[PDB]
Design a binder for this molecule. Sequence first.
Ligand SMILES: Nc1nc2c(ncn2[C@@H]2O[C@H](COP(=O)(O)OP(=O)(O)OP(=O)(O)O)[C@@H](O)[C@H]2O)c(=O)[nH]1
Ligand SMILES: Nc1nc2c(ncn2[C@@H]2O[C@H](COP(=O)(O)OP(=O)(O)OP(=O)(O)O)[C@@H](O)[C@H]2O)c(=O)[nH]1
Ligand SMILES: Nc1nc2c(ncn2[C@@H]2O[C@H](COP(=O)(O)OP(=O)(O)O)[C@@H](O)[C@H]2O)c(=O)[nH]1
Ligand SMILES: Nc1nc2c(ncn2[C@@H]2O[C@H](COP(=O)(O)OP(=O)(O)O)[C@@H](O)[C@H]2O)c(=O)[nH]1
Ligand SMILES: [Mg+2]
Ligand SMILES: [Mg+2]
Lengths: 43, 427, 428, 426, 426, 68
Amino acid sequence: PPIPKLPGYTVCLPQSLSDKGFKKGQTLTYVNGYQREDALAQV
Amino acid sequence: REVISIHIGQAGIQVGNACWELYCLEHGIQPDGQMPDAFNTFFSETGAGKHVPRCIFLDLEPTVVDEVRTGTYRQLFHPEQLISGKEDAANNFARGHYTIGKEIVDLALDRIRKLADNCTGLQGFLVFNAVGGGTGSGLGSLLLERLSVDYGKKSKLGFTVYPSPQVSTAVVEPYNSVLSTHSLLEHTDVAVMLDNEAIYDICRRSLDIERPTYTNLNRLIAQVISSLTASLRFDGALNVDITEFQTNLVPYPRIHFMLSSYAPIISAEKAYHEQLSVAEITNAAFEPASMMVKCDPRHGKYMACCLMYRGDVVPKDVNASVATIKTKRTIQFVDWCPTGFKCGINYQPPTVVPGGDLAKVQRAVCMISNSTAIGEIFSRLDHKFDLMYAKRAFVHWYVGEGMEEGEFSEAREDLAALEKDFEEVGA
Amino acid sequence: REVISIHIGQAGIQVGNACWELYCLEHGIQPDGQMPDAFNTFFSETGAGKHVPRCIFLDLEPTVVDEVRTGTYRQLFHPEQLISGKEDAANNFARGHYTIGKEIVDLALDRIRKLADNCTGLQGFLVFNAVGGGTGSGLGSLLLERLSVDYGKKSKLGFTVYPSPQVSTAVVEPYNSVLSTHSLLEHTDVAVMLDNEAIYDICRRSLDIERPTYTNLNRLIAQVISSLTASLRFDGALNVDITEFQTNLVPYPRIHFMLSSYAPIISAEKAYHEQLSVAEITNAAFEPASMMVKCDPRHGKYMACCLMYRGDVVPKDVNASVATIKTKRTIQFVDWCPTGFKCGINYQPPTVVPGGDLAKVQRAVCMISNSTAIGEIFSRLDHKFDLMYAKRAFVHWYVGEGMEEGEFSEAREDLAALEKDFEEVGAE
Amino acid sequence: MREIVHIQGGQCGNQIGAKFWEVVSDEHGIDPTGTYHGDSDLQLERINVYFNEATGGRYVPRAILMDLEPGTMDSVRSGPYGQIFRPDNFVFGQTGAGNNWAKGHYTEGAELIDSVLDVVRKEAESCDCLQGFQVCHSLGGGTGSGMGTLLISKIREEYPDRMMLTFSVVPSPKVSDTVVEPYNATLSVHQLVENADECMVLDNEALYDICFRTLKLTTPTFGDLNHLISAVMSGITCCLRFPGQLNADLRKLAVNLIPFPRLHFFMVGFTPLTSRGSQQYRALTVPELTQQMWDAKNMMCAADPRHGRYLTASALFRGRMSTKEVDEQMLNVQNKNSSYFVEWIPNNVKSSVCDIPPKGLKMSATFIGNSTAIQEMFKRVSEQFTAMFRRKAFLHWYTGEGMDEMEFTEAESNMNDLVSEYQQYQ
Amino acid sequence: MREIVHIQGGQCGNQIGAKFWEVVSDEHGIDPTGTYHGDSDLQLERINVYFNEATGGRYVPRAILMDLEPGTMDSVRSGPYGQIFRPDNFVFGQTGAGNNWAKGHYTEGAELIDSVLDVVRKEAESCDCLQGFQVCHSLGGGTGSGMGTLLISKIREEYPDRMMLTFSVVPSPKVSDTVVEPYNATLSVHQLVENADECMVLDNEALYDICFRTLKLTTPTFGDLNHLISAVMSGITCCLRFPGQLNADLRKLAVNLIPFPRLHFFMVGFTPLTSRGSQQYRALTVPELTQQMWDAKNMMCAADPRHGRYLTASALFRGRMSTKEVDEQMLNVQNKNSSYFVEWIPNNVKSSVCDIPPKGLKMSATFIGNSTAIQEMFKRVSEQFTAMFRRKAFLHWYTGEGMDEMEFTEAESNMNDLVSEYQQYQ
Amino acid sequence: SRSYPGEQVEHAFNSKRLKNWEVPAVDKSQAISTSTGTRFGTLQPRSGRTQFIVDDNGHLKSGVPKLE
Ligand SMILES: Nc1nc2c(ncn2[C@@H]2O[C@H](COP(=O)(O)OP(=O)(O)OP(=O)(O)O)[C@@H](O)[C@H]2O)c(=O)[nH]1
Ligand SMILES: Nc1nc2c(ncn2[C@@H]2O[C@H](COP(=O)(O)OP(=O)(O)OP(=O)(O)O)[C@@H](O)[C@H]2O)c(=O)[nH]1
Ligand SMILES: Nc1nc2c(ncn2[C@@H]2O[C@H](COP(=O)(O)OP(=O)(O)O)[C@@H](O)[C@H]2O)c(=O)[nH]1
Ligand SMILES: Nc1nc2c(ncn2[C@@H]2O[C@H](COP(=O)(O)OP(=O)(O)O)[C@@H](O)[C@H]2O)c(=O)[nH]1
Ligand SMILES: [Mg+2]
Ligand SMILES: [Mg+2]
């Protein structure tokens, strides 16, 4: 069951033939400000 | 990374009427306005559990607007996001550009300013209008002019609906279209044409709908917009944002007119019947029987191409396809661009609307190219402007509204310079 | 390795109907499109459990195409391939080559384009048409011209149906056949003749049907096509692809007209009667009473011969039979061709279609040869063409539809030059 | 001790680096939570080069993810090994580049590079002895090439004494991703030949060729391409992280490979690469490795070395091997191909051996050949550049942002005399 | 030590190769799955000449299958002993020559031979000391004759000091498969007489007569003919793989057979070949082997030796035999039929003995006689070639591929002065 | 547009291998002026700086010739 990390060993399932969906979340975003803006990193 | 979409006129807000239905269906938002964070590019989250779109439907006739206010999406759209005049513009560019604009546009741009202030990572604007109307053309041009002086450097993706060569629902629309273009030159950053005749052709050929209404047109145009904004919304193996088309497709500051296409537009029968791979849909995206603008790119030479991909696409086959297309000679580029493509890949497959006529396909392609057949379109359009204006027809209405007669002369010579541009640039 | 089929006309798509029923039977594909990888040369497995053929039926009259659209194989073919016009070309080469062809042929070839794009190891094209009719002749020739300018060097097997000498259904079909052959000369790589009177005689004599319809003709034609593509489909002890007839049968770049024949065409009780063995079936594949073209090769000299074998056959006995044929002096080969044969062997025996008239057999032969009897046929045709042309009968139709007299004259003299060519080639 | 500060610019750099830190963490036995879980205590002794201990077995990478759009960053943070990066190291813009080298080097760099420099400086004096910097980016895009280039120039101005690697993918004409590929590539190469210490060219065509001929995959997603490049980067730095019979550091490799200060564009390879269908039919011997090494189908660059001469080369072997077979194989391959090796340099091959193979293998290798056939690639780029620049296509989105035409003309002269001197030494 | 790499060209070549590797594989006792299952130790030490131990008892053949269509490859891959080849050694194309020598030598070879050369070169440098190359092809087909011919030319250009065997089948008019047989044969022989070291001429007509008269088989399939040819090839190189009292390598047989560099077309036989009903009434003595070996009705060519002079001859014997009986039989056969041997060479027979018979038999033999009756077959082809070429039949196919007419004139000149020099030494 | 030699991958980018199956575009491949002349070859080295053929906004200057 353990398998090496070498190139080409693992073939991932396409996951798009299934209805999964790949919405990406804004975990990095700026904070409302004028000239000065602060970056925010969340969990 | 948020993009706000403004809709001008009868066609504009009817395309957005289908587009926003697609958006709510893609992000799982109820027509109430709450889910049962990728939505953040379209829906602002107000208070607690309430999503209000980033758009402005503006028009002069209150009919279709308050129809929206009374329809299914009463609660979704913000009460004041829908802006509506009192009297129509009536297919009259001057009437919609000088008489009615001077009171509606200052309220509109004041509104859009506080939408941009609520925004955080504004990517750009994307506008929806038809140049046949007086509302879409007149104050559409006035709004774009005052937007360019307001922000300027941010992109304004314009998805316009130009009049068809023979299928037409107006008489003065050559006058309107020419006078709208004369300002769409130096204001719009990237302008995409959409002819209703070519979409009628596609609805007949592929979806085999013998009697389509405007809704099927609006529905598949929404599919196209969703397919070229999917990179912003969902993550892909090779994503490409809004401000990219500005750099990859416009080789000259006055040559920005893009022939859109899409593939696969397919019915529920032929989808079950045909194997849909990346090779044939890359071919099918180039066949002029599947373009959204009635022209013949074989009659011209391509300038630059952009290929948005959705669904199950691994890079090997899209690159192998681009290779095949480069080896074929039924299509040929201009002698400038040895790197004539812009590939883009997104993971998510296109969604279906219950009641729509498109089948669910695992993959899709949206091609936004540039050629000289658009220079053929403007020549045909300028001929039937030349016919009517030689006899001073209909000029009385425009002069009464307030346009000086010269506007006509300089708009005609501006198109003439545009013909020279395509003729020399293609050399 | 794939090969695609295009059918031009009434006869074209009826023969194709027979052929595709046959192919489904040979590959075990139920008519609804799925089995209950040899098929990959004819059907492309779409999705999961669905096979669509590599073919297009194109025709101008909508009747027979709609008949296919509502027949049993509604699910097999898929409705984007069956190209159907609105009004016929009506036995008129001009109407089918200038008036209606110039609107239908672009859609036709632009469908062929993406069929070939789906293809991977394309062996060649094969066209099915009867040159007597209007569409199959006229826009058949138009499609072949534009297909050759699109592809050029690829093999295009043309299984054409010429009008029989004395039994005929039309009147202007001599004009049609001449004007079709004038382009079939310089655009077809390998052209196979199939008259109908010879097939009628076969069905009368061997299969002892005294009143045959077109289904039997098309069925045995489909058997012939299956026999010459079984080398691509199934493994043989000595296989041969499609591009080989291109090389081994046409000595000169204008002489490609091949008499086809088949054996054993034998009914069930006669199969109970006679033992089937390679020697006698090879002998049977050489008499005029078993050729598909009503001509007598006794009067001709063989230029070359290709022999496809199917079923339970070993090479030793085909060697023996070819030897004894070369020893017998009833038939003679041309002077400058000493090695006039080409054998080919395939393992799978020909199948039977239920309700068909041919009995199942251990082995069979399909000969595609070349002689000068065809040079006889073309003169027999030029005679009755000049008959009607001397008084300018029926010429007003073509001239009004868009040709002129120069094209008639040049086709006539081209066939005359072809006659001279056959004479000089037969001359030792 | 010797430290490698890893910098990832742009989309290509961010995704390759995502797989890169996956592979490195797997080699050192660090779980995706951030704790050590290895077996042999060889893996402790050399994680200072790539990690910093935070709190009780919490090892965080020494990497800086820099770009303009969070899209790539969120694709990174989604997958596994995503919660190990330090949130202060996500220096980050908000506008977007748009395949515009000028926007990535003049308009947005001028407000972002200051904060990037603050982060990379803090991460520089955090450690004791810098071995060098290591940037992975692209040459077609804007936010990778332009911003990465300005960072390279500023860093080389600040710390000029330490080494510097640039893993950069290059454009090909048939995988023509962007339309302004030559306008970006030519300008970036013009910057790399005076700022980068040594450059390793990569191309997607050579990667596809590897994945389909050697690997014989069916669906080579970008995960595998980024995995190939990751294995190459790991094989480069292997000799620092694990003890060997013949140690070869980065500076040691640079002084053996770069004969002249401008000839530092290396084409890279990696071995063994075999399909899972043919992993049963082969053996694992040093000759079988080196035969796969010097094969033209195993380079990761779209330039056939057989069209030119090898100037110098290097082989980094991993695993318990015999140095007699190592040197004999390098000597044989040098005598047998007497035409493809330059004449005025004897013993054109540097070799080294480390005693720790990658997990799951017995013996691996990494090839770094400083050939001369790279001038064909620069011909290919420069020719396209002149094709567009003669008629001024797409130029105004650069001219309007500050750039002049002389930068393009200077980019041409440096590309053209560089290919001139490659042709001279050939 | 000594190595023989195998090349199979075309349909006939590929099916001969499949049976040949099936015969060798149980000659050395290895199962079709690729592991050893024999009993004696004498099978182990001499499989370096044909196989490579891969990993844990996996012996793969040292062969390069080569053609243009997958029909022959799949016919090979279907049957048993078909899953032993390495998939990297299968070089195939998507077109097909179609018995067009011009296609097999100018158009398709132009894009396949590069990869064929890379695989044969890899399979030649994987070993230490080449003994020779061994090709099996036809002289009628296109992808076998034409490409096999081009490959022979390129190989002999590269490796001129190593041996080279060509098992080529030639046609007859009674067994006349291709219509352009003379156009293929004449051009291919025109190449084989300046490139191939020696050619062992086979033909199917004689094989049919052998399975008709001698074996008394009812229905001889191609499998049995291919089994005859493989037993011949096994008998040729038994001395390399097994110890004998008098050894004879391929180069040793070459120098003993070929008196002049152009006279290297050998006719071949094999014994014992007896019907299963008549195996009971015979004995097993060296006289019983030679009486069947020297029969004109047992040569595998359509050249009756009593029509001409035996220039030289060779006999390879297998089994525990007494050399006094071997050499005395060779002397007697030479003394009785004394007019059929050339006068100016005494003791025209090379002879050698190996101690290991084929499994199941007690004694076997293989005959390689270089006679001057082979000019019968070359004239039998040359007259057909000039018969067609007077009328220029079938010529457009060859001319269109870029071949001119002077290539045909040179081919016929080489054929004519060659048979002129056989007639001289007869 | 032109397709340049890849020198490693053109063996895989032959049109016939890409399922083109038609007579391919060799216009794009002759405009290169490679050394061998075929698609397998090496380009020519270029030196100097390229002057401006075109005027501003993409209009050919009067001196340079063009196809009408
Ligand atoms: N694609 C599309 N076009 C539409 C639709 N409804 C109207 N149009 C187009 O509208 C054009 C005429 O202008 P309209 O959009 O009706 O009017 P307007 O732009 O609001 O301007 P006014 O009529 O002066 O108020 C025609 O070219 C129509 O084809 C629709 O649902 N879809
Ligand atoms: N072998 C065979 N020949 C047929 C068949 N049906 C029609 N034909 C021949 O076709 C010739 C005339 O052409 P048709 O096929 O009838 O019609 P067409 O070719 O489509 O031409 P149009 O009538 O103008 O449309 C006649 O000589 C018939 O003998 C058939 O089922 N089998
Ligand atoms: N190997 C690999 N290459 C990539 C990946 N994403 C993009 N690229 C390459 O990046 C090139 C374009 O650079 P781009 O992504 O626009 O860089 P950026 O926009 O400045 O960050 C293309 O040629 C791609 O081949 C990836 O995930 N893996
Ligand atoms: N001995 C033998 N000869 C064969 C076999 N199959 C074909 N041939 C010979 O091959 C010749 C034809 O060559 P061909 O196979 O078409 O060559 P290719 O087309 O270039 O691969 C004929 O003369 C046959 O006698 C076989 O199984 N055994
Ligand atoms: Mg309106
Ligand atoms: Mg008809």
